[PDB]
């Protein structure tokens, strides 16, 4: 946002970028796109009228999206033809897409330790426990 | 009525009843102190030699020559090559702190020897590029790499077999057998962020990985990556990672990531953002180079740095289970002078919810009980006395009067 | 902090709410009962004595529970009414059931359990009211009982509660009289203690309130001395005070 | 220059061109931790401090006596009392006994008051107190007088998001400086506060604050004395019973007593006089010594 | 390893009753001291060149001190001036091309920058004052009671240096790092001041607030320096008193200033038990509040023995009294048990104020002999700041 | 050479071009209050001989307290236009600066600036922000508000006694203030500014309007008698907006009709209420 | 409040502090020289929808006639900020379809898009 | 809640 501290150098960098963005008008082939993971700390100046004003909203994916997202990062692996990616999505909530990839990568690894080629559905589920660091123990009072 | 001590009063208090040696003795003590003070000053200045070589390996006649003919050359970096006509290049050189200058080579150097970006030496007067210089090998970063392999082997890390196995499949296995991770096409996690309660084996599972490395292990201090001058933190992060890509099979171990991995927050009115921009120069850097990280407090790490795009794997070092605590015990007691019989299995159930280190102090205190009383054999009775002081003595209150409820 | 509910035990084992409650008695008026053979007295203070305030009861701080039992109050006004209501109902039940006056102490235990019971079940606020009891019985004659918000009671020979309890209690000790506690000596001390315990000097008669309990021909008259006799009482102490200055 | 005089941390001066040492120069004390040294002794003398004849005497057994005549303590075999904590209701003389000990002290009387050791940059608050007890040793015997000690030494709170953590690190310095690994010789501290329960128990443990002198609101023979030390320069009439004015002022702080004297004199300057009569006082003991009532019978009978 | 630069303690003179045995023993110390001065002074006077003089002429005056960064050739190294610049200076012959190490502080010629000398022992003035030279004067016999606490603090800092055979003959590694915690005024720092007057190993001290510099890296770099000197000077003890100043519980602070203190704790937390294990540098922390220290800084392995210092017990309080009333002059009526027995939580610093006060209440009545009333009065006058705070008569 | 020091406006020491421009006769009524302030922050600088002739050191602080909108700051805006000292205004919230050790230092810079440029008047308006009764602080925020009040207390009457530095303070509560900052010595005269009675309202009306163009039929005594307890801003309001109604209609003279149209807008302050609190 | 009716300088600058909740605002803030005039601006005026669309619709080329009236009821309680989008979002519908808006059928769905998708 | 903040100094 802003803040003689030693941040009067990055402040010049921003105003410079702030300067040029408004310098050139639309109709040009200089379309700009900027990515931030924390939009509550950005300057309001950065997003006012002629700067990044039409702001793109990236959500944390929904359940159907997660089932798909867990597919794209699994194509290059020999996943078994019977892997109900949909069922995996249900167990995979509050998951950012990257974590949705972590299950795929973890799924392949978990198969490795077991000495298998095709990732079974179980391997994927074990990833959904090891992607979040949880350690699945067969608690006794369930039966 | 606290009557103030009249001057008449003071004279008597200090002489009436005085032991006839009082004035003399107090004189002797006062004499000594001043005498000691003077004694030091006459000798306090102790010569601090300044690293001169033996007289044999001197060339004082030639030494006057080097100082006279040779000249100091400012070390700079070529940031661009204008190549004015391809015959008068007019290089632009950075003097680091001095300024940016458009300089030209002294005749000694070859036009083709000074390639863009390489460190170039200039002359103090005109800044003509007199000599090329080897790329920068950081004095601090270069010392960082663990040149002496830590002695702790993998057999010293007990009760964490599944956590060591999980680490060996990211830090060792994908580095010695890059064929199981290719057949299935699984991308090896290129970093693990060991977290666990303080004293569970995070840095022991770090030294252990170092003793069986076959790689170049770089021990990132955490302290050195936070420098006074702005930017010098990030400049070190690059100069470490750059020093890794140059090596083949390099492992970087950022112990105590909390130092330079705090969750971001706008505090630009202060030097904190200096450290934060050093992490953002590390987040960019991270996302054959494997990266390790240890953090007894993972919750203080930036969510960005814990995503499965940078730290693909997160190994949790939990408190050992019983079958492991009896193993953590035997690892630290293999060198103790214990009596053959000790029911270590029994000592594992008396240390419930105890870390992998407090088991160590139970073994270290056990002897100290065997040393206090001159027995050269640390018997079992000592350990229960040990587990009372190391674990129980600081575990909780949970005492008899409030423990006669459990039977 | 563990002062959220009256039923939560602090780690050291202290029911904070009860400490908070009984300590709350400090803000209340001062009531004292002096040692006395053949009698015992209560002296209260009318903290709010504004002018426009019509005096209709004359006994804002001294209540008569049974035909031979009187108790003051030092604490919350609302809780004081409910306790004084429960006190009398307890005493009269005893008279109905046993056709014999409730022998003092069993009155305090009955109320103390009610007050304590609040300090056990949750959701009820600890009664913030201590109250002196005086009276007579066929069992021990004149007695003095000091109730606390925390339910704990206790027999006493001379005690003060509420404002400046420390000053009153010590002085009641300083000139504490055992055996020689005739009523007249009790009255002189009682006003004598209020003189310094009550910050405003001159112990203006209307600003003090004395009720005495005597055993007369087996009738146990509980008295609330009127202003006239207090004036002479204040005068009686007032005359005695001047003679003490002769030391200078 | 004899090299024996060049101790570490000196401030030698080096010649302009050849960098040769040619003088030792006075030692460096931070520019802010040097204004704290009393150069101008105040003008409050003991004779202007009434009623505190006991406290002034209890405070001289720590500030004056142990310094002027240390031989008494050595023979008696008891260590030297070091600090005093002058607490008490506001306006009693706690900063008046201090200006007095500064007018008759013949001992460098440094003055660190309130938030003068609380600096924004971390590890600077600790530095100033380090240089304050160094300027108090090279200039010993010295008396550091820290007024409003509630500011820097309130009870240590648990380190967290919200909790004093820098005024704490400078508290843990003063805590160590007074009675720490390194014993201190001939430095005495006269902290003055109003609330004595909000200090951390390490700062009120004997060894750092030996005597904890209380300053209570004056009594009638103390209000009278105060009313006579601040009305000495006044043109009092005859029949101006300063005692009856005092008897009209129960629990009158002690600085309020002067308010009656300034106000009794202020009731005259509006009339262009130089003489203050009795009714000029009794009409002014009501102004300065004013009160706020609960102004609510609803709340006031909550408690019987 | 320069060896332990132990403190310099003059021998001790006991008797203390101020008897002639005392004067003679002080005189003997003085006599040798006068003799010792004689040799130092008579060595310069009795004491009444062509090789070094040539060297000093090549160096000239003054000589800058920058940080070496690279040994390009055998006779060329890049040295960074004291401002952060760089320089491709020449390595002259007199310098030792052995001690020249990257990171070493090199002496540079002033006119034509050229390595001329290697300046070892460049430890900051901020850590070279941390070293205790004049040993404190409180011997283990000045600390009364605390026999269980002393032994615990003598089996990590004294014994492991005198009888190392016991520990290495049994398999232990001598406990290294002890957290002295307890209520204020119990003797935490006195036991520390007593290990310095007995130890033969360099006794560095800090105050837990000295090692928090304002600069971003000044903080963590002083700690990395202190444990570099303690390691350098062989047997050493680093006493970080009032450790609560630096090492409090880590937390997600929204203030950069507080993220630099923790970036100093996470350095003391790695300069103690982390990669590249320590050498022989014991650490003695002290703190009145062990309930706020980070669970890691006092995790067994860094602070192995948590010596707990309770308020004095009745037997100890009686021994504490005599150690502070040893030099006093009590009258025959001074039966201390009247004050000790009380249930007042009289700390060990309270006891020495009930001694200073009862000796000053003696001057009030013009007496250098303190009677029994001088303690009764002093107990009250010295026992404030704690008043009386407890529950009412609820519990029976 | 010793160059002249520079302390002209470090903390907004009122320059010769920042005079508030409110004369004493412009303030309306406040006859008693004006004299009490005129007796501690104005008179002693001029006539110090009179004070020393009676043996009383002139009062050094004044604390104007009363209901909001009653003219407290106005007397202060005046004393500034009418003072030969160096007025130094500082609002209470200006001390609450972040960066602990910047707030308390601001106090130590205000009394240093006033000490150098003496005699001076330091007017801490809205002192209720930093001088609320010290309830034991248990977080690093109430602790830094208390470090400000104490730094305030320590310079006003502390070991370093200042010469000729009077302090004027204004607050709207007057009871929340810490007892140490109301003890006769720091804030000596606690002047009260009560809601204008049926008389001060007349004087207030006569000074706000005596510059306004009032059409002869406007009997200001018709509105000064209405029992409603209007405050000083409200009287300035009932007048400033009264004319704004005239200006809208383009009429250059405020007529009696508007004042009644104005008079019903500046006093129906309930409006919302909710009818069930009554 | 001080920086407005405040000693320093009264000034010649003006403030337009606009709120969404007027009950919340403190009384002092609404005064003659301390922020006056409680100008209410309710959701686009019934007729405005036309004018607003008139001022915000015409810019985008659209030869086809307009039944604005239906768009008005098709857009009840519209925030007006939505109305700006209505025409612009319609332009995206046109950006797909072809290049010239020739149908109100566009605003209808555009009205829906700037309603259900603007919820 | 309300958090007072310290600060360092990047040289
Ligand atoms: N599980 C364990 N098994 C064996 N030794 C252990 C174990 N845990 C701790 N230790 C002992 O403690 C030493 C260091 O403990 P550890 O490596 O866990 O520190 P750490 O996790 O880095 O602590 P922190 O996170 O607070 O820095 C090990 O070298 C070993 O001697
Ligand atoms: N006993 C006394 N005799 C004379 N003057 C007194 C007495 N007590 C207080 N005063 C006067 O009261 C005024 C108030 O300042 P004082 O020195 O009392 O500070 P304080 O309120 O006690 O402490 P602090 O300044 O720390 O708040 C001073 O002018 C002081 O001289
Ligand atoms: N057991 C004891 N025997 C003898 N003297 C003691 C004892 N305990 C404390 N003392 C005395 O306490 C004095 C000062 O206390 P000490 O320095 O030991 O406290 P501390 O542990 O540093 O306290 P703090 O928590 O305030 O830092 C010493 O001079 C010493 O004489
Ligand atoms: N007696 C008065 N004479 C003139 N104007 C007054 C009077 N009382 C109030 N006012 C008006 O109200 C303002 C008073 O400011 P006020 O609200 O009292 O300030 P603060 O609340 O900061 O003390 C003046 O600027 C003026 O417009
Ligand atoms: Mg580690
Ligand atoms: Mg200590
Ligand atoms: Mg104002």
PDB file of C-alpha atoms and ligand atoms in Angstrom, chain D residues 175-176 179-181 202 205-208, chain E residues 138 142-146 182-191 193 241-242 286-288 312 316 319-320 323-324 347-350 352, ligand 3:
ATOM      1  CA  UNK D 175      15.532  -4.420  36.598  1.00  0.00           C
ATOM      2  CA  UNK D 176      18.962  -5.894  35.911  1.00  0.00           C
ATOM      3  CA  UNK D 179      20.504  -5.415  41.121  1.00  0.00           C
ATOM      4  CA  UNK D 180      22.014  -7.591  38.418  1.00  0.00           C
ATOM      5  CA  UNK D 181      25.092  -9.658  37.689  1.00  0.00           C
ATOM      6  CA  UNK D 202      10.624  -7.531  40.414  1.00  0.00           C
ATOM      7  CA  UNK D 205      11.486  -6.388  45.562  1.00  0.00           C
ATOM      8  CA  UNK D 206      14.034  -5.254  48.164  1.00  0.00           C
ATOM      9  CA  UNK D 207      17.390  -4.871  46.478  1.00  0.00           C
ATOM     10  CA  UNK D 208      15.982  -2.556  43.821  1.00  0.00           C
TER      11      UNK D 208
ATOM     12  CA  UNK E 138      30.160 -13.981  45.990  1.00  0.00           C
ATOM     13  CA  UNK E 142      27.593 -16.711  50.384  1.00  0.00           C
ATOM     14  CA  UNK E 143      24.541 -18.527  48.967  1.00  0.00           C
ATOM     15  CA  UNK E 144      22.589 -20.140  51.765  1.00  0.00           C
ATOM     16  CA  UNK E 145      20.499 -23.231  51.261  1.00  0.00           C
ATOM     17  CA  UNK E 146      19.840 -24.087  47.626  1.00  0.00           C
ATOM     18  CA  UNK E 182      11.570 -18.678  40.198  1.00  0.00           C
ATOM     19  CA  UNK E 183       9.846 -15.862  42.042  1.00  0.00           C
ATOM     20  CA  UNK E 184      11.641 -12.506  42.194  1.00  0.00           C
ATOM     21  CA  UNK E 185      14.299 -12.260  44.873  1.00  0.00           C
ATOM     22  CA  UNK E 186      15.037 -15.957  45.392  1.00  0.00           C
ATOM     23  CA  UNK E 187      18.698 -16.042  44.380  1.00  0.00           C
ATOM     24  CA  UNK E 188      18.669 -16.754  40.656  1.00  0.00           C
ATOM     25  CA  UNK E 189      21.337 -14.187  39.800  1.00  0.00           C
ATOM     26  CA  UNK E 190      23.337 -14.791  42.978  1.00  0.00           C
ATOM     27  CA  UNK E 191      23.879 -18.442  42.120  1.00  0.00           C
ATOM     28  CA  UNK E 193      27.343 -14.630  40.287  1.00  0.00           C
ATOM     29  CA  UNK E 241      19.791 -13.151  32.530  1.00  0.00           C
ATOM     30  CA  UNK E 242      16.186 -12.025  32.170  1.00  0.00           C
ATOM     31  CA  UNK E 286      17.497 -16.947  34.266  1.00  0.00           C
ATOM     32  CA  UNK E 287      13.892 -15.824  34.333  1.00  0.00           C
ATOM     33  CA  UNK E 288      11.212 -15.052  36.900  1.00  0.00           C
ATOM     34  CA  UNK E 312      12.968 -19.806  50.886  1.00  0.00           C
ATOM     35  CA  UNK E 316      16.953 -22.036  54.411  1.00  0.00           C
ATOM     36  CA  UNK E 319      20.642 -19.925  56.882  1.00  0.00           C
ATOM     37  CA  UNK E 320      19.942 -16.984  54.582  1.00  0.00           C
ATOM     38  CA  UNK E 323      24.927 -15.255  55.625  1.00  0.00           C
ATOM     39  CA  UNK E 324      23.681 -11.642  55.659  1.00  0.00           C
ATOM     40  CA  UNK E 347      11.966 -13.916  49.750  1.00  0.00           C
ATOM     41  CA  UNK E 348      15.752 -14.019  49.943  1.00  0.00           C
ATOM     42  CA  UNK E 349      15.968 -10.421  48.792  1.00  0.00           C
ATOM     43  CA  UNK E 350      13.472  -9.478  51.487  1.00  0.00           C
ATOM     44  CA  UNK E 352      18.623  -8.655  53.093  1.00  0.00           C
TER      45      UNK E 352
HETATM   46  N1  LIG I   3      19.421 -18.250  49.231  1.00  0.00           N
HETATM   47  C1  LIG I   3      20.059 -17.087  49.387  1.00  0.00           C
HETATM   48  N2  LIG I   3      21.116 -17.041  50.222  1.00  0.00           N
HETATM   49  C2  LIG I   3      21.758 -15.882  50.384  1.00  0.00           C
HETATM   50  N3  LIG I   3      21.503 -14.699  49.821  1.00  0.00           N
HETATM   51  C3  LIG I   3      20.450 -14.773  49.005  1.00  0.00           C
HETATM   52  C4  LIG I   3      19.692 -15.899  48.733  1.00  0.00           C
HETATM   53  N4  LIG I   3      18.678 -15.603  47.834  1.00  0.00           N
HETATM   54  C5  LIG I   3      18.850 -14.330  47.584  1.00  0.00           C
HETATM   55  N5  LIG I   3      19.898 -13.763  48.260  1.00  0.00           N
HETATM   56  C6  LIG I   3      20.336 -12.377  48.183  1.00  0.00           C
HETATM   57  O1  LIG I   3      19.594 -11.745  47.172  1.00  0.00           O
HETATM   58  C7  LIG I   3      20.378 -10.644  46.687  1.00  0.00           C
HETATM   59  C8  LIG I   3      19.881 -10.236  45.325  1.00  0.00           C
HETATM   60  O2  LIG I   3      19.026 -11.267  44.791  1.00  0.00           O
HETATM   61  P1  LIG I   3      19.386 -12.006  43.446  1.00  0.00           P
HETATM   62  O3  LIG I   3      20.332 -11.184  42.669  1.00  0.00           O
HETATM   63  O4  LIG I   3      19.861 -13.420  43.772  1.00  0.00           O
HETATM   64  O5  LIG I   3      18.023 -12.140  42.676  1.00  0.00           O
HETATM   65  P2  LIG I   3      17.568 -12.597  41.224  1.00  0.00           P
HETATM   66  O6  LIG I   3      17.354 -14.051  41.152  1.00  0.00           O
HETATM   67  O7  LIG I   3      18.579 -12.011  40.252  1.00  0.00           O
HETATM   68  O8  LIG I   3      16.235 -11.800  41.003  1.00  0.00           O
HETATM   69  P3  LIG I   3      15.372 -11.198  39.816  1.00  0.00           P
HETATM   70  O9  LIG I   3      14.278 -12.134  39.445  1.00  0.00           O
HETATM   71  O10 LIG I   3      14.884  -9.849  40.340  1.00  0.00           O
HETATM   72  O11 LIG I   3      16.379 -10.967  38.692  1.00  0.00           O
HETATM   73  C9  LIG I   3      21.819 -11.135  46.726  1.00  0.00           C
HETATM   74  O12 LIG I   3      22.691 -10.071  47.081  1.00  0.00           O
HETATM   75  C10 LIG I   3      21.815 -12.221  47.813  1.00  0.00           C
HETATM   76  O13 LIG I   3      22.568 -11.813  48.950  1.00  0.00           O
END
